[PDB]
Amino acid sequence: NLPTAQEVQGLMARYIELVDVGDIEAIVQMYADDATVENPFGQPPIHGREQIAAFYRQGLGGGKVRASLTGPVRASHNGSGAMPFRVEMVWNGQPSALDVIDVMRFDEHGRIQTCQAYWSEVNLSVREP
Amino acid sequence: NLPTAQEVQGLMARYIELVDVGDIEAIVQMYADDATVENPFGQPPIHGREQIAAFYRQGLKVRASLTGPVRASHNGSGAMPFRVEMVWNGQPSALDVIDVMRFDEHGRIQTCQAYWSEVNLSVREPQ
């Protein structure tokens, strides 16, 4: 059915794990086939599994990415949630840290229908040697 | 104009301050007159300054503080993690929340959505 609050918390936390390990295949599996992704929010939405997989491919690729929850997943009783996390990756050839909040809405099958990632350069920090 | 990323960060941080001190009048001033509020998200949206002010009125022995940086976009929106301290069911309680806000070209809140539920509620048991 439609993910309960606790179920949302588990799903969104799993998402972060798949990202941390770069399991593109599993990430895309979590998405509905008609899902939309806006990342960073304010960019044109990307639609469907093909484009979503392409997005994760170029992002979780050649790069060198880590991600971890920095706080509890906030979950509603209508299949949505939001979570704070931190991403470690290379930005402009330098080791960087990005603070992000993702908002996700799930369908009655527990697949991500909508994901929106909130962050910009103000949330980017370039780490010293 | 439309709030820059840094401006969004400042506005959203100011919102939390007004809440912390319970300045209902100032809170409502931050909102556009036609703004919508969904709090908790998944509840029927509340529309306009009258209803919004009524919402904050009945809601506001409360404390609130940012627990992390405001995430801000380049299109006038942002999201922030924070913690609310209040009485829930006659007991001292803590609530973890994330608010997502979208601003208009006048720097007023057009849309606010508060993400939280009972899973994010913790009660301080009587000691």
Side-chain angles (χ1 to χ4, degrees):
Chain A
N1 204 23
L2 193 69
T4 69
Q6 304 165 194
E7 287 168 351
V8 173
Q9 286 189 301
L11 288 159
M12 293 181 75
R14 161 158 193 250
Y15 171 83
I16 293 294
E17 289 298 351
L18 303 182
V19 169
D20 188 43
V21 321
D23 193 349
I24 295 173
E25 328 291 317
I27 309 265
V28 179
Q29 187 63 29
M30 289 196 68
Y31 276 95
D33 44 7
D34 64 315
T36 75
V37 164
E38 297 164 77
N39 190 338
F41 179 82
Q43 293 281 126
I46 116 179
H47 294 268
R49 278 207 195 191
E50 186 191 18
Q51 292 181 13
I52 288 169
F55 173 68
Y56 280 100
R57 189 155 305 282
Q58 43 111 163
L60 279 184
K64 256 283 192 173
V65 178
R66 197 165 213 69
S68 72
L69 271 184
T70 47
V73 175
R74 272 69 159 181
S76 75
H77 293 296
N78 81 148
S80 305
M83 62 187 166
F85 62 102
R86 156 169 286 237
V87 176
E88 314 282 348
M89 100 262 270
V90 173
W91 186 94
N92 216 329
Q94 278 168 307
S96 294
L98 185 68
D99 296 312
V100 191
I101 281 173
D102 273 6
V103 174
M104 289 177 174
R105 201 183 75 220
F106 296 80
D107 67 12
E108 59 290 336
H109 295 108
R111 297 186 195 284
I112 305 165
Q113 198 64 69
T114 270
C115 188
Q116 297 142 308
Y118 295 85
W119 63 271
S120 67
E121 284 72 17
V122 301
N123 300 121
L124 217 182
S125 314
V126 64
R127 344 176 83 187
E128 296 297 290
Chain B
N1 203 23
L2 194 68
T4 71
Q6 304 165 195
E7 289 168 349
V8 173
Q9 286 186 304
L11 284 162
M12 291 183 75
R14 161 159 193 251
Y15 171 82
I16 293 291
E17 288 298 351
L18 304 182
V19 170
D20 188 42
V21 321
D23 192 350
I24 294 174
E25 329 291 318
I27 310 263
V28 178
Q29 188 62 29
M30 291 195 69
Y31 278 95
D33 44 7
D34 62 316
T36 74
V37 164
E38 300 163 75
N39 188 335
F41 179 84
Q43 293 279 126
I46 115 179
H47 295 267
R49 277 208 195 189
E50 184 192 19
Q51 293 180 12
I52 288 169
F55 172 69
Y56 281 99
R57 189 153 306 281
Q58 44 110 162
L60 273 185
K61 249 286 190 173
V62 177
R63 198 164 214 67
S65 73
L66 273 182
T67 48
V70 174
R71 276 66 159 179
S73 74
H74 292 299
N75 80 147
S77 306
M80 63 186 165
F82 63 102
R83 157 167 285 237
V84 175
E85 313 281 348
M86 100 261 271
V87 174
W88 186 95
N89 216 329
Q91 279 168 308
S93 295
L95 186 69
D96 298 313
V97 189
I98 280 171
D99 275 5
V100 173
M101 284 177 177
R102 202 183 74 221
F103 296 79
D104 67 12
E105 59 290 337
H106 295 107
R108 298 186 195 284
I109 305 166
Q110 199 63 69
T111 269
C112 187
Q113 297 141 308
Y115 294 88
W116 64 270
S117 69
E118 283 71 15
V119 300
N120 299 115
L121 218 180
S122 317
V123 66
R124 285 63 181 270
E125 289 302 330
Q127 284 180 12

